[PDB]
């Protein structure tokens, strides 16, 4: 009825309008049909939309798009490093992982002190320029002709290539996510 | 007649309330009925 | 179960009246308190029923744009509406006809309010800052008085000579209807004390009170006698809100004088004691704006008229 | 005509020879000829002193007659004529509560 979204993720407008786009997507994690929302963060922000179901996001108390946790706003390891919990058992196959979901449909963040460790590592004010635009992959290779008017960042990568190859599932579960 | 009397009336079962959960209010009591807040340690969250 | 003293004879003691389809923005109980006028931003008037099944028994249309603002007329089979589309319109209540369509206002006829003691004449003030007079059986307007600011919210005294107007000038004014029989009258009384703009006004049970609420966020108690202190101000009232929608929202006595309902923009109904001047009743359940709020003409029900195209019709326990 | 407004108004009729006619009005042609259901006759008597000229006008009851203008004088009124539900619901609701 209303995505689980970061704040970050919903940019500085009170009013937001956005779409929702009922079995609009898989889930990334559950490859799940579910509803997608799509909206505008901002005036400088692009159009982020929701990436993975509605449970599977608030099982691990995450942000449907961007997949930090919703407390504090950092990735689902340095949250469960911090949270000293357990490796997911969750199942990575996909009959394993629907099976545990209707199970657990047919019949642990909220209650912790606040982590100094998690509040030391955490960014103070939002991350808002998460909500822009992509860079301009003509810009890059040289051959953009749109001018100052693309709707792309107008700038190259500037990345770890390590990084920018981060997947959905680790992000989601914890296991070997770069950032 | 004024002899003694007390303070322990106008308590207990007139003051109505609503379980701390239900979201619904079934009937259209005072502010200090329906409203006047659960109680407790904040809790974490 | 629960067995919390009863008081009406409404089926239940929180009844929601679904059927509109647009913002409801007056609404009115019957004289004679069997029935309701309800008029909606869908330019229509529900007449429902108070008791035993909540029917709406008829739905008049005829009015082109949001029909703002309803009284009944003092016998109850006739009602006055008024609305966006510059056009009040008396209507015979059983029947479903309209009776008498005057459309002389140039822009959105706000408010109006029809004489409870005399002849069939009715107050309405509208967006042209010029609030009019009019008697039921000539077709031109009785009076017409020019303020400069748009008129929000008008009412007729109870006496009957008298007329009250407020609006965005930050001034409430009374003014004198037989003293003016010309076409720049100066005004009577200035109420001041809001800090801006007045949207609702109400003729207390015995007329020496009369209420305001403003986007002041404050409801304001007025005496109307006219040998009062220099400071006419009574009462203030805190709880209630006025947001950005900038809606009509209202005043109401209870039918005793006990009590006072304000429609807020926070959803809530909210309903003082005059005497203690504190919160009684904060009840929840709407999800728009609460335009105007009605006590029921006997018992102590209240109905509330919301932004959201419903109207809860219940009673009151203490 | 006027007493179009006159049809089912019960009235009295004068003739030449000054007797009354009472009954109520059916139809009526342009020759002045009336229909006059449940007429009486009352016919003036001379009044012989010591007695009330209203209290013994000779009625005879005629019954439906129709009435020719040609001495048909004067006509009055003698009394009276003789005898979407809505789109709306209202369903029982809980006020909801945020907490
Ligand atoms: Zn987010
Ligand atoms: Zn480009």
């Not at chain 1, 792309?152 to 579960?173: C, F, G, I, M, V």
């Not at chain 3, 309405?124 to 800052?129: L, P, R």
């Amino acid at each position: 009825d209303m995505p689980i979204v970061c704040e970050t993720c919903l940019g500085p407008n009170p009013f937001v309008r956005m779409q929702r786009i009922e079995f609009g997507g898989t889930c990334h994690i559950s490859g799940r049909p579910y509803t997608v929302f799509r909206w505008r963060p901002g005036n400088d922000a692009r159009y982020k939309k929701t990436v993975i179901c509605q449970e599977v996001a608030k099982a691990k108390n995450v942000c449907q798009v961007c997949l930090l946790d919703l407390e504090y706003g950092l990735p689902v390891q340095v949250r469960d490093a911090a949270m000293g919990v357990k490796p997911d058992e969750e199942p990575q196959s996909e009959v394993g992982k629907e099976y545990k979901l209707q199970m657990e449909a047919d019949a642990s963040y909220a209650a912790g002190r606040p982590n100094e460790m998690l509040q030391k590592l955490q960014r103070s004010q939002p991350y808002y320029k998460r909500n822009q635009a992509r860079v301009c992959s003509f810009f890059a290779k040289g051959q953009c002709t749109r001018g100052a008017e693309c709707p792309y960042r107008h700038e190259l990568p500037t990345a770890d290539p390590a990084l920018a190859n981060q997947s959905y599932k680790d992000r989601y579960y914890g296991t070997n996510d770069p950032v | 007649l004024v002899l003694r009397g007390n303070e322990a009336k106008s308590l207990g079962e007139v003051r109505k309330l609503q379980d701390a959960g239900a979201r619904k209010v079934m009937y259209n009591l005072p502010v200090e009925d329906m409203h006047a807040p659960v109680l407790g340690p904040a809790h974490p969250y | 179960k629960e067995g919390i003293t009863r008081t009406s004879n409404l089926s239940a003691p929180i009844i929601q009246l679904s059927g509109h389809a647009g913002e409801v923005f007056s609404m009115r109980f019957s004289p004679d308190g069997q029935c309701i006028a309800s008029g909606s931003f869908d330019k229509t008037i529900f007449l429902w029923r108070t008791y035993d099944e909540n029917e709406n028994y008829n739905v008049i249309a005829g009015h082109r744009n949001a029909v703002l603002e309803v009284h009944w007329f003092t016998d109850g089979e006739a009602l006055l509406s008024c609305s966006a589309d510059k056009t009040a319109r008396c209507w015979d209540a059983e029947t479903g006809a309209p009776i008498k369509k005057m459309g002389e206002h140039t822009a959105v006829v706000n408010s109006c309010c029809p004489l409870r003691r005399g002849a069939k004449v009715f107050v309405t003030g509208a967006d042209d800052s010029t609030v009019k007079v009019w008697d039921m059986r000539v077709k031109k307007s009785v009076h017409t008085l020019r303020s400069e600011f748009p008129v929000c919210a008008v009412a007729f005294a109870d006496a009957g000579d008298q007329v009250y107007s407020g609006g965005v000038d930050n001034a409430i004014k009374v003014w004198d209807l037989r003293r003016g029989g010309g076409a720049d009258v100066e005004p009577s009384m200035l109420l001041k004390g809001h800090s801006d703009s007045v949207t609702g006004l109400r003729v207390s049970p015995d007329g020496g009170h009369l209420l305001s609420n403003a986007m002041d966020n404050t409801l304001r108690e007025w005496d109307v006698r006219p040998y009062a202190p220099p400071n006419r101000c009574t009462k203030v009232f805190t709880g209630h809100m006025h947001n950005f929608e900038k809606n009509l929202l209202r005043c109401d006595y209870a039918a005793d004088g006990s009590k006072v309902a304000c429609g807020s923009a926070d959803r809530m109904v909210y309903i003082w004691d005059t005497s203690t001047r504190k919160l009684l009743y904060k009840l929840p359940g709407h999800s728009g704006s609460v335009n105007e709020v009605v006590f029921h003409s006997k018992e102590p029900i209240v109905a509330s008229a919301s932004s959201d195209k419903t109207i809860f019709l219940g009673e009151l326990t203490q | 005509s006027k007493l179009l407004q006159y049809i089912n108004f019960r009235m009295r009729v004068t003739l030449v020879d000054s007797r009354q006619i009472v009954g109520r009005f059916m139809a009526f042609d342009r020759h002045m000829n009336l229909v006059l259901g449940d007429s009486e006759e009352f016919r003036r008597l001379p009044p012989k002193k010591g007695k009330s000229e209203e209290e013994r006008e000779e009625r005879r009851v005629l019954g439906l007659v129709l009435l020719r203008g040609e001495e048909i004088v004067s006509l009055t009124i003698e009394g009276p004529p003789p005898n979407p539900g809505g789109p709306g619901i209202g369903r029982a609701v809980g006020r909801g509560m945020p907490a």
